[PDB]
Amino acid sequence: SDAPDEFRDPLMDTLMTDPVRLPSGTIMDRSIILRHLLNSPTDPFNRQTLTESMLEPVPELKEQIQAWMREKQNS
């Protein structure tokens, strides 16, 4: 959509619906990063080692995105 960059996944440039934070500080869609971790236990960008347990959900951003979406449906 016309979604703000901050709402998009850094890797797939798709709208994030379940934003998680990588220890690096990078925020991704949970599905997307878990896909990557399946073949490589690393941060997709800085190459550091990474495991699922280290991901931290970003509820604030998730509500922000869901709201932005629900506001679009109301047009």
UniProtKB/Swiss-Prot annotation:
Sequence ranges assigned to domain U-box in this UniProt record: 2-75
Localisation per UniProt entry: Cytoplasm; Nucleus
Tissue specificity as recorded in UniProt: Expressed in differentiated myotubes (at protein level). Highest expression in ovary, testis, heart and skeletal muscle. Expression is low in colon, thymus and peripheral blood leukocytes. Almost undetectable in lung and spleen.
Positions bearing Phosphoserine: 40
Disulfide bonds: none
Mod. after translation: Proteolytically cleaved by caspases during apoptosis.
Function: Ubiquitin-protein ligase that probably functions as an E3 ligase in conjunction with specific E1 and E2 ligases. May also function as an E4 ligase mediating the assembly of polyubiquitin chains on substrates ubiquitinated by another E3 ubiquitin ligase. May regulate myosin assembly in striated muscles together with STUB1 and VCP/p97 by targeting myosin chaperone UNC45B for proteasomal degradation.
This protein's domain notes: The U-box domain is required for the ubiquitin protein ligase activity.
UniProt similarity note: Belongs to the ubiquitin conjugation factor E4 family.
Assembly and interaction partners: Interacts with VCP/p97. Interacts with STUB1/CHIP and UNC45B.
Protein name: Ubiquitin conjugation factor E4 B
